[PDB]
């Protein structure tokens, strides 16, 4: 959720946006339940 996205943006102050967008882009679901990151979430992170 983007409501969590804003909190992540607030807390991830030390790391620059480049590493943040990269790590979100390259995230992998190790187990079945986990799902890939939405492109809309990426856009929200980038714009915020």
């Amino acid at each position: 959720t983007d409501d969590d996205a804003e909190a992540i943006c607030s807390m991830c102050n030390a790391l620059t946006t480049a590493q943040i967008v990269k790590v979100l882009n390259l995230y992998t679901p190790v187990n079945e339940f986990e799902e890939r990151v939405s492109v809309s979430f990426i856009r929200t992170i980038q714009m915020r």
Partner: protein
């Protein structure tokens, strides 16, 4: 094999607009069956007809947990639409 094809499976139908389109398998698979019920990605159930003489059952879509892996050979059901889907995901979804 017949064991692989079950209910709520995913297979790739060759199509003109998209070379291979994913499709659900609502109907249970029947060995030597001429036609099967398949749910289209559009949402409209399609009674796609199989060729029992020469045609083969469509390639099984690999589980999405395997999608996004770096190695193309890492996919279980290894075939052209699987590779196409994986590379499309990596180029677009994974940038």
């Amino acid at each position: 094999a017949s064991e692989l094809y079950t209910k709520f499976a995913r297979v790739w139908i060759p199509d003109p607009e998209e070379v291979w389109k994913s499709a659900e398998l609502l109907k249970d698979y029947k060995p030597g069956d001429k036609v099967l019920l398949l749910h289209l990605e559009e949402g409209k159930d399609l009674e796609y007809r199989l060729d029992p003489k020469t045609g083969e059952l469509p390639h099984l879509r690999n589980p999405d947990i395997l999608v996004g892996e770096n190695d193309l050979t890492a996919l279980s059901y290894l075939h052209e639409p699987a590779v196409l889907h994986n590379l499309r995901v990596r180029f677009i979804d994974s940038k």
